Design a protein around this ligand. Structure first.
Ligand code: ADP
Ligand code: ADP
Ligand code: MG
Ligand code: MG
Lengths: 121, 232, 233, 120
């Protein structure tokens, strides 16, 4: 019953995040880039967004920024899950609106722990 | 230069982290989901681990071949070889990487096959795959047609291989600079594409050990043609 | 930092990373080709190897990353008040495994009573302790009747004085300052099947000097080394 | 029933090589270095030596050499399974005795194919 908007240009990453999310019960929806990601929000509104940074066409910091502009998108929490490991990259994403930032390589159980923590409150 | 050294060190870490994330994710999932994984899913998540190690191994063999050529250990071993089979074989092996970015890979021969030559087939297969891989890696972001054609010919009592693409192309400020160790063009459209900058520095140097040369031609945002020439 | 040493370093990364890939590849092709022939607890073990050899790699890729950030000075440390006594302990646990595999015992005493407070980045000094501790195991002797690495903790000069003492190969005097240079490794005869990047101590000199601290070494060959870390209070 | 000497300084490598070898019914005996492998050869003569190059105490090129100096060690095959990718490393090991050099990372299935070939 909990929709989660998975957003990463790597098809591999998608498979395995989508697998761990479907273990808990969640209902994944997948997007190759930021543009597409934003493009599928017309369709539905998710309880969670799992956002990459480095994608083609549209970037992940750009998705986060737009997430704060439109008022229906501000309240939905973003986890950022990125290979960008700089402390400087984390602060930009947090300041751009992301609720947590997880690095890659990641632990699927922690990511899940954290995905729960946002949804449960 | 110490400048491009540091970026290179960062690029290796950047390029080795992608398969590793996979390995780590798939390996922990399998280990934490044996009861929740069916068989064709177990075998698949393993196949990813195996597949992403092979990407890793490649990238380590890039570093190693490079260092080898830097210390001039890499002597080639020449034999009579059909270059038509070599190239078919080589593109066959790039079909998966291609289809993942939706690039098609064609192959014509302007002369009739088979095309014999005195070359190390390990090492020219390596040259073909590096040029094909760059064809796939530097294709345009979205397009209906995206491609990489290899072309065979016989010019100047030698063999002339062209690897043609319709990808992003190269600014003239980097038609001389693409072959130097560590060099990459840093635009908006190469940001998230991985690579060390060594691939062509190796390919230039393998080709030059055969007594051959490689040159490039590129129209910025329309495509590129890479010319490898080896003697008979 | 010359072009020659860059080439030796590119090889060294290649060598460092090869080893866990071999495990990863060979453990993972086996599981795939032996689902019939692994009992459950040997399936779980072989995956535990894959997971653990990927951590080694990951560690290793963070050495490349940290160093690159320190080069371009992206890395700024974030200081906080920390207990150093249990910080030290926790790092010692994290090397327990690596140590035993080389039959290295790993000790800890404090000449000052615990717990010792300090304004440090705990992430970064944890990193500084592990590199010194690892090096302590990595550069142990071969013959193993009493090999160790001891972390001693004192308070000197309105500051904290961490010492990491080992009893291995020790370092030749014509190299005792060139171990902190990037890419520098000792090319001895009891030093070539020990992989490394030559970056671990460069990083650690740098983190300690982002803190306003310093590191030095006193090494008596065939006997051992002591590595002195100093940060203020 | 066949008896393989396994000579690498990596617990990890040994264990997974031992596993694939024992999949075929072969019987493994292991060695931490080159020196120990030779000390173990006095307990038994093996059908196969899987030999690493880089190990502390006593090198793997050295073992290969010393297998040429003693009598019942000359005609027992070695496969070298090493991280040393150099083409010059392979030549040395072939001319210092080794019947075959396979590189690391390796395929367990190919390795096993080649072990079989040299036992049969
Ligand atoms: N087919 C191509 N089309 C456009 N640009 C290319 C092509 N091939 C190579 N390049 C450019 O040349 C650079 C160096 O290539 P290479 O040495 O293989 O390193 P990399 O691993 O970065 O691809 C690339 O970073 C890219 O900017
Ligand atoms: N505790 C130690 N005892 C003896 N030698 C050491 C010790 N720590 C470091 N070294 C020497 O310093 C060199 C560089 O160390 P470091 O910068 O950590 O890189 P690495 O350990 O990856 O080689 C090593 O190659 C080794 O020769
Ligand atoms: Mg990406
Ligand atoms: Mg070894």
């Amino acid at each position: 019953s909990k929709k989660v908007l998975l957003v990463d240009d790597s098809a591999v990453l998608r498979k395995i995040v989508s697998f761990n999310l479907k273990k808990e019960g969640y209902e994944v929806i997948e997007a190759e880039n930021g543009q597409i990601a934003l493009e599928k929000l017309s369709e539905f509104t998710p309880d969670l967004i799992v956002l990459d940074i480095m994608m083609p066409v549209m970037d992940g910091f750009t998705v986060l920024k737009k997430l704060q502009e439109k008022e229906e998108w501000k309240r939905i929490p973003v986890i950022v899950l990125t290979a960008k490991g700089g402390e400087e990259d984390e602060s930009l994403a947090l300041s751009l609106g992301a609720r947590k930032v997880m690095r890659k390589p990641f632990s699927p159980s922690q990511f899940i722990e954290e995905v729960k923590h946002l949804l449960n409150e | 230069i110490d400048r491009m050294k540091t970026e290179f060190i960062a690029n290796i870490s950047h390029e080795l982290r992608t398969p590793l994330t996979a390995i780590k994710a798939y390996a922990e999932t399998i280990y934490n989901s044996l009861g929740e994984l069916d068989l064709s899913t177990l075998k698949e998540f393993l196949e990813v681990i195996i597949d992403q190690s092979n990407h890793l191994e490649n990238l380590l063999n890039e570093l190693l071949d490079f260092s080898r050529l830097e210390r001039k250990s890499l002597q080639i071993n020449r034999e009579k070889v059909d270059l038509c089979d070599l190239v078919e074989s080589a593109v066959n092996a790039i079909k998966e990487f291609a289809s993942s970015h939706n690039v098609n890979v064609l192959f014509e021969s302007n002369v009739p096959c088979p095309v014999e030559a005195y070359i190390d087939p390990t090492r020219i297969r390596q040259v073909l795959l590096n040029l094909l891989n760059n064809g796939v890696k530097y294709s345009k972001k979205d397009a209906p047609d995206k491609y990489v054609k290899v072309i065979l010919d016989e010019k100047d009592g030698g063999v002339l291989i062209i690897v043609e693409d319709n990808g992003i192309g190269i600014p003239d400020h980097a038609k001389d600079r693409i072959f130097e160790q560590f060099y990459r063009v840093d635009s908006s459209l190469t940001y998230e594409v991985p690579g060390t900058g060594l691939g062509l520095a190796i390919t230039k140097e393998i080709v030059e050990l055969h007594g051959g040369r490689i040159w490039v031609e590129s129209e910025v945002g329309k495509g590129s043609r890479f010319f490898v020439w080896i003697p008979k």
